Amino acid sequence: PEGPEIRRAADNLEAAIKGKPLTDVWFAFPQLKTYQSQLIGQHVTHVETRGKALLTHFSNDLTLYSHNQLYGVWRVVDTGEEPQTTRVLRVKLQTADKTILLYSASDIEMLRPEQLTTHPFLQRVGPDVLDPNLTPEVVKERLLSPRFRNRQFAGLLLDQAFLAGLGNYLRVEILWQVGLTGNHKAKDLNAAQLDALAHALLEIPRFSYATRGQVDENKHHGALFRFKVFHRDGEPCERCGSIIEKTTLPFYWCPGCQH
Ligand SMILES: [Mg+2]
Ligand SMILES: [Mg+2]
Ligand SMILES: [Zn+2]
């Protein structure tokens, strides 16, 4: 989607003030002033990435949404420090030692939990599977949410609105892992299957990412992560021996042990 770049900024912010009691909170926008005193003593629980946007979660359930767009930039300084940048300050989240400042950005809003689901931008891009904060429990929730619970996995696993960081190659491996064909929906699964699928949606993408070697390394060394059905059409399933199939109207799957 954008690589570490997007997740990099979120991590910088977390490292600086995650879990630390806020000693001062300031917002430039008039409609945001009302949340200032309310946040004193609270802390950022985590920073979620959503496309090129950041969702700064607070322990009181409020969430600060920010999209740098063209000029926004977050800076971490020592509490008390006053940068000499001419950029306009929009947000200041201060803790005892570290302070993070958002300059120039215009897309800044405070959201309650129920507003996250209805936010235009957020509806278009879901959480990233490589985000350490994204947990299987959160995944099962999205799968069961009225918005997705009735979508076929074949298309859902290719839709960034559900989860970002997925691709066809990951989609087919994930479904093979839980023995499902692309026509199923989260609403028809039992608790066991749902949990199984929720873990696979994260484990497989992370396993593939963490172990990919350099370019052309495959010429002398096979990767730790091996595809089971992707590009293996015509080969036997390692589980049941059936011949892996590929569609033509690509979904790869074992018709022998996936249904
Ligand atoms: Mg080597
Ligand atoms: Mg079935
Ligand atoms: Zn099989």
What distance in Å separates the CA atoms of residue 121 and residue 57, rounded to the nearest whole number?
Answer: 17
187 is catalytic: no
What distance in Å separates the CA atoms of residue 147 and residue 118, rounded to the nearest whole number?
Answer: 11
Which DSSP helix (H) or strand (E) runs through 50?
A: strand 44-50
DSSP state of 52: T
**Domain identity same for 173 and 224:** yes
| Distances 118 to 30, 66, 112, 147, 163 between C-alpha atoms, Å | 23, 16, 11, 11, 16
Quick check: 225 and 211 in contact, CB under 8 A?
yes
Pick the catalytic residue from 20, 52, 92, 246: 52
83 is catalytic: no
Residue where a domain stops, chosen among 104, 126, 148? 126
Ligand whose nearest atom lies closest to the CA of 254: 3
Q: Is 124 marked as binding a ligand?
A: yes
Quick check: 50 and 126 in contact, CB under 8 A?
yes
Q: Is 212 marked as binding a ligand?
A: no
**Domain identity same for 102 and 26:** yes
Distance 214 CA to ligand 1 centre (A): 10
Apex CA 51: angle with CA 79 and CA 19, to 5°? 35
Full strand arrangement of the beta sheet holding 53-58: 44-50, 53-58, 63-67, 107-111
| Distances 96 to 32, 104, 126, 164 between C-alpha atoms, Å | 22, 24, 33, 35
Helices (H), the chain: 4-17, 36-39, 113-116, 120-124, 136-144, 153-156, 168-177, 191-211
Instruction: Mark the breaks in the chain: residue after which each occurs, C to N over 2.5 Å.
Output: 249
**Domain identity same for 139 and 219:** yes
If one counts every other C-beta atom within 10 angstroms of the C-beta of residue 9, the result is 20
**Domain identity same for 174 and 201:** yes
Q: Which two tokens stand for residue 59?
A: 């322990």
Domain that holds residue 6: 1-126
**Domain identity same for 218 and 121:** no
Question: How many domains does the structure of the chain reveal?
Answer: 2
CATH code of the domain containing 12: 3.20.190.10
21 is catalytic: no
**Domain identity same for 20 and 115:** yes
φ, ψ for residue 18, nearest 5 deg: -60, 130
